[PDB]
């Protein structure tokens, strides 16, 4: 397609998130680059409001799916860089088991030469001391796939998968996340077979920042055709 040429090489990305969790306002503010030929994303995000009300590992998939790396042979399945540059909209229902659920709403869209991603989030039903809002969770973050399937009637796509955070006491919290993307311009989009993108994310700290952040490496291949 028309906008997989705008990411043949290293694309500079904004994340801005607002938040509200259970009450807990919050605001993100992430910076980077993506290079789709390696499926690679280096970004840190920055919590400009305070201290993160959540962990950060939980709002690792809100905080850029068309920087996956579709092989050759799949380029006609990839959706997320067909939408572009006008962009698309990423809604989400993630459903943490026994505790609350946040509802996402992003819009991802060049401005510019700039891949931005804006975000707002709204966490309800959340128990004040369980593994979310108790802080309880690992600062790090599994492999998985993303189940993508096409939505012929949107025009876009929707993936199901199944989000596992690592609990600090060798147990699980299971996220389970519905996605609808449509796109937001009106020229034709791919829409793909059913496949999955295989993920890989590392979390970590800059030694030199006080404030309250999150640097990931995420590397992100499509399959499954
Ligand atoms: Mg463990």
Not at 12 to 30: A, Q, R, T, W, Y
Not at 62 to 71: E, K
Not at 190 to 201: I, K
Request: hydrophobic letters at 30%; a negative charge; proline letters at 4%.
């Amino acid at each position: 397609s028309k906008g997989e040429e705008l990411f043949t090489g290293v694309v500079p990305i904004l994340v801005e998130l607002d938040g509200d969790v259970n009450g807990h306002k919050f605001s993100v503010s992430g910076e980077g680059e993506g290079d789709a030929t390696y499926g690679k994303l280096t970004l840190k995000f920055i919590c400009t409001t305070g201290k993160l009300p959540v962990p950060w590992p939980t709002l690792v998939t809100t905080l850029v799916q068309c920087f996956s790396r579709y092989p050759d042979h799949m380029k006609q399945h990839d959706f997320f860089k067909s939408a572009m540059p006008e962009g698309y909209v990423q809604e989400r229902t993630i459903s943490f088991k026994d505790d609350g659920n946040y509802k996402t709403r992003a819009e991802v869209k060049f401005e510019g030469d700039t891949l931005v991603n804006r975000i707002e989030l709204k966490g309800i039903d959340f128990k004040e001391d369980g593994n979310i809002l108790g802080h309880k969770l690992e600062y790090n973050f599994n492999s998985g796939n993303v189940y993508i399937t096409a939505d012929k009637q949107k025009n876009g796509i929707k993936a199901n998968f199944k989000i596992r955070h690592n609990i600090e006491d060798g147990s699980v919290q299971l996220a389970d996340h519905y996605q609808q993307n449509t796109p937001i311009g009106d020229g034709p989009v791919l829409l793909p077979d059913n496949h999955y993108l295989s993920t890989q994310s590392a979390l970590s700290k800059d030694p030199n920042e006080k404030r309250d952040h999150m640097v990931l490496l995420e590397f992100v291949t499509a399959a499954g055709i």
